[PDB]
Symmetry: C2
Subunit: 456 residues, 2 copies
Amino acid sequence: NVDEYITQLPAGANLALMVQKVGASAPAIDYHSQQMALPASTQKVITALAALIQLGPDFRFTTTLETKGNVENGVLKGDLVARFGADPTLKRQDIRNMVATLKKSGVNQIDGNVLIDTSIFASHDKAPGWPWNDMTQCFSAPPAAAIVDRNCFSVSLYSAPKPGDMAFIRVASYYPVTMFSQVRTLPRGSAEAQYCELDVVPGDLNRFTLTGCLPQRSEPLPLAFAVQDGASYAGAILKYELKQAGITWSGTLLRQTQVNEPGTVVASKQSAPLHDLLKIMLKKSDNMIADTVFRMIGHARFNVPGTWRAGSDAVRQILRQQAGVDIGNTIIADGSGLSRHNLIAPATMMQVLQYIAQHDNELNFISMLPLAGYDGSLQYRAGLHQAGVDGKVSAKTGSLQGVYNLAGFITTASGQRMAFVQYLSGYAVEPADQRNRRIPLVRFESRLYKDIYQNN
Amino acid sequence: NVDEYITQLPAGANLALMVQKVGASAPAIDYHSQQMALPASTQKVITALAALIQLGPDFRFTTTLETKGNVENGVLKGDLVARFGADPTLKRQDIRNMVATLKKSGVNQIDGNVLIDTSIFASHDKAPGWPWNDMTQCFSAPPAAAIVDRNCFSVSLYSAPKPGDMAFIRVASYYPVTMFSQVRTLPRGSAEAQYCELDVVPGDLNRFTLTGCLPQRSEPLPLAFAVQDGASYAGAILKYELKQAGITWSGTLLRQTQVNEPGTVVASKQSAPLHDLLKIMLKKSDNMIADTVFRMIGHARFNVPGTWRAGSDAVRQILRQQAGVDIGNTIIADGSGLSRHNLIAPATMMQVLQYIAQHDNELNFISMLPLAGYDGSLQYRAGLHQAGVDGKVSAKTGSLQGVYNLAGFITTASGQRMAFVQYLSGYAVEPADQRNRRIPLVRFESRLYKDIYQNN
């Protein structure tokens, strides 16, 4: 009763839906299944499959400290190279530990430069089609080769005691960022409060200026921002840890972007295995893992510095050649599904899902998807809970402004496993319902998945 | 025969279409007319109507030089204020002329600062939902309060005679930008040519670094880029013209962002009348005119510094209250339709078109739209030409990656004027047809508009 369920959805919402028994050639439900749609985070299903095929479940991201030169009386005669490898999980502590190791190896002094090597990747750290306005939010932090603590930092914004005085920014001293406040404090219920925005404006070298207005508050406003220049940020952390460890240097911090022969690895850190990271990515919808993986795929397949375009070409090739899926006129712009350039039909995603199901005993893939009523994004998906399908749906959510997708598998009343793709976009509510916007979605899903479960 | 014409379109393309006699309550063609879609540049139809209602056809953008202080023996004892007003047509020459006027007024020296006043607007000069990657292209130049020559500048990129040497940037000395090249010159058919990108990276104060690779060429590559900091850019031009005119100052160039009482206007420039600018906007799809107008509407309606959110609220209010159109769950994010956040149903745009037709003798609006086979965007729209409808269609195009819209009016074989909205999105061709992508569109439109013209 797809058309009737659509009446639950806001005026003009667009649904493309396909449901199909695993291993069957014909769908049980086909509503606009050929129509292109924004996949949002369902794109991560494709990223996870292509990653497992190209890189394998045991791949690990790697970061190293390398020396190029002889060490004489504790003095490295040459450069220290910190070779970043797009590990989305690298932490300040890992840098501290690698420096401790460098020290313990006998290096007290560097007679040369400290090089921040990001040559594993090239071109922009932002995919085409990402909205500019989200770039300072942590969920959209540029997934660069140099990442430390997700390239996200927090700040506290304090209103001034006196109205008209600048609001005050508190930030932990260890973060190599520079914060400036041009935020005017307003009276508690002021005229300017309506249309005066509070904005973050990023500048070079990880400078941030906050601008606009802040109404007086009793509590500081917590804010978290994305680092725009990961290489500089990682360099500054490395510089700090070297100094704390008592290692001096005569040169400067420089970026190294061009491919080069590795020196002697003196310290290293490897991530958890790729399967573990893909699990986090799928359960929690982790954009940074998705997009580091995505540019890694292109780098590994074509033996070139990883770019968005190489990633896209690689994923298309892997799907066609290894998974037997010709994605045709599909557009793949990134790994996370953040890009508004991604375009894919339910029928194409269905072929991907059918491949995964057929090879699930090899891939151990379905266990990584959120299980309705248990974990990840579907721990409490109201429509699925109310449909009676908790524990019966393993699926990836995909949400962006105007988009509420689901793609995955459902075990129905007969015990039949069905792959399904729900692509719902053009979703908008009227201004007076914007912070209550999800109730129509719940109504729709409660009905559809009860229908699918009961009748199959 | 809408469904059959759709077979001309690429796999999975999404059409929402409505055609309706002017003044009629029921549509002649209704194919998904209630469904939300990306309007692209058809949004400019709404912007033009709301602008004429709020500002009127005779509104002019204004830029001034103002003095605050007494002038003693040719010395201004106080500040020079350059008050920008978002005029999208202001030129270097206009600044030169206003400075000439300031000189002629008796000011030889400023004992104070030179203030670049942008207080007419506030918050970001980029609307929510604009893709970040286009921001350095001139068609997406941030439409700031301070614009000079469309905040666009050109550059010539020369490959190095020797492979491996940096490519060279030539730029006219009068442009206050700073260009850096890290572009490596490659052999004419090299290995790196495939996945090594040529990129522009904007920095603070109108710095641009070009990075990546450029294959050797006999001719320099012409490039044009958008200015990211219009206030600094306009300030530098003002500084240059003051110096050339022999006016000295003791202070510095500072930005003035807060609303303030105007000083004595000593020089000014007003744009052409708004109706003339709206005509350019509609004929040529001028994003900068659309978006300066859009933030001006909010500024004029609410008497606040213009923002994107004030513009959106104002346009919704104007449509509902003055045009009798409740846009319901429609999202309006900007004036140009660049934003991927814009969402509107053909039926809503249809109400706008019906209003314009009913009031055309008041507004003189339809004459501003491109006329098929004559001007603007429709001078050679192949599908319309092949449909036999040249001289019979006045309509606004809307194109973005994946989107080919038309909205406007058609005079049919019976002489009946019909309003129509064609919203076609999810348009994608396979990699091997991307630079030939428009042929399916032409096939579709040739058929649809011949059908509409002949049968109505």
